[PDB]
């Protein structure tokens, strides 16, 4: 099959910067009939891919001018002249010149932006969750950058390693930040150490960890 | 406007078969080609093949011959794909997509069908409300705990609240997925205990408001 190699794999860009994605095929994407059926697709987080460029250089209905495509034979480039916060997601080249049709592996476009501290909110277990016999303490860390963060849960000041589930969103399409949810799961120890439940976050925006807690 | 509405089972046992559908609208179905694309979770795109809906001719990626069968119903403008003898390597999102000019590239894509191949049975999620009276901004939570399989759809006030929402991708632990969503609203609102996130787990037919 025709290999489609996309370079780079991950491309961190600042808003306004230009962005260049390359794609190289193991075989000429020039069909016998003289046409070069090379497309670019964009997949944003949680959505289907959308056509950006067809036939190497043609922009598809409603695609901004800042998206340009060029190349010939085996070397192609997609250029985003001025990058916008909504431009993040994964860019794939695709060749329809030779069966089987093949996509590149994808270039994750990522936005560089200024650091941002997380907004932290702790939550006690639901009343319904307790009637069921469980106890999950939740901790949201919203709108921070970069995604690099550490969360430590503390029960009566002591630290608990087991029973935590963390999850990060994809990069936000407007403020280019991330958010994270951290969950602690207990059953009845929640009444054993019923006081001093603490969610402590350490991020590069401060030498001091950010604390949110509750006891009763 | 072109619409590609996909549907199909989201959880199937290994060795079983599944048939997905793609109901097209907004254009003359029988004059075009339909492509199908596969995307494993967290991975790239793979072309499965296409069906010429005018003459029902098919063309497959060799890798999917004997795994995929493309068919269509011209009376209802619906394209189908059957996957046979499924394994965990077939767990993926499957997209149909219209070829407007020929049979070599696609413009409009369906929203995809999420397919999990597994012996584990469906499991309804427990939806739990998350409440704090802290400050003039308020963040309430919705914990959707212990469900299987993916996906779920979560909304707040029937999609009325959009901006200040973060839904976090589900995580699998204990062989069950746990998802959560937070919502931060202006002072021009209340911290209503159960501001009503809307959880839907079609795999188990759960539609909850809590």
Numbering used by the authors:
A (entry chain L): 1 to 216
B (entry chain H): 1 to 132, 137 to 214
What does the paper say about this structure?
The DNA-RNA hybrid–specific S9.6 monoclonal antibody is widely used to map R-loops. We demonstrate that S9.6 exhibits robust selectivity in binding hybrids over double-stranded (ds) RNA and in categorically rejecting dsDNA. To understand the specificity of S9.6 for hybrids over dsRNA and dsDNA, we solved crystal structures of the free S9.6 Fab at 2.3 Å and its complex with a 13-bp hybrid at 3.1 Å resolution. In both structures, the heavy and light chains of the Fab stabilize each other through extensive hydrophobic interactions primarily between aromatic side chains (Tyr, Phe, Trp, etc.), burying a total solvent-accessible surface area of 1783 Å2.
The heavy and light chains of the Fab are covalently linked by a disulfide bond between C219L (L indicates residues from the light chain) near the C-terminus of the CL and C134 on CH1, as evidenced by the disruption of the interchain linkage by a C219A substitution or dithiothreitol (DTT) treatment. This interchain disulfide bond is mobile as it lacks well-defined electron density and does not contribute to hybrid binding. Hybrid binding does not induce significant conformational changes in the CDRs, suggesting pre-configuration of the paratope. The root-mean-square deviation (RMSD) between the two overall Fab structures is 1.8 Å over 379 Cα and between the variable regions is 0.49 Å over 210 Cα. While CDR-H1 (denoting the first CDR of VH), H2, L1, L2, and L3 are nearly identical between both structures, the loop of CDR-H3 is more extended in the absence of the hybrid, with Y100 and Y101 in the loop shifting by ~4 Å upon hybrid binding. This more relaxed CDR-H3 loop conformation appears to represent the resting, low-energy state in solution, as two different crystal forms with distinct crystal packing contacts exhibited the same conformation. Conformational rigidification of the CDRs often correlates with increased binding during affinity maturation of antibodies, due to reduced entropic cost associated with binding. This observed pre-configuration of the S9.6 CDRs is likely at least partially responsible for the high-affinity binding of S9.6 to hybrids.
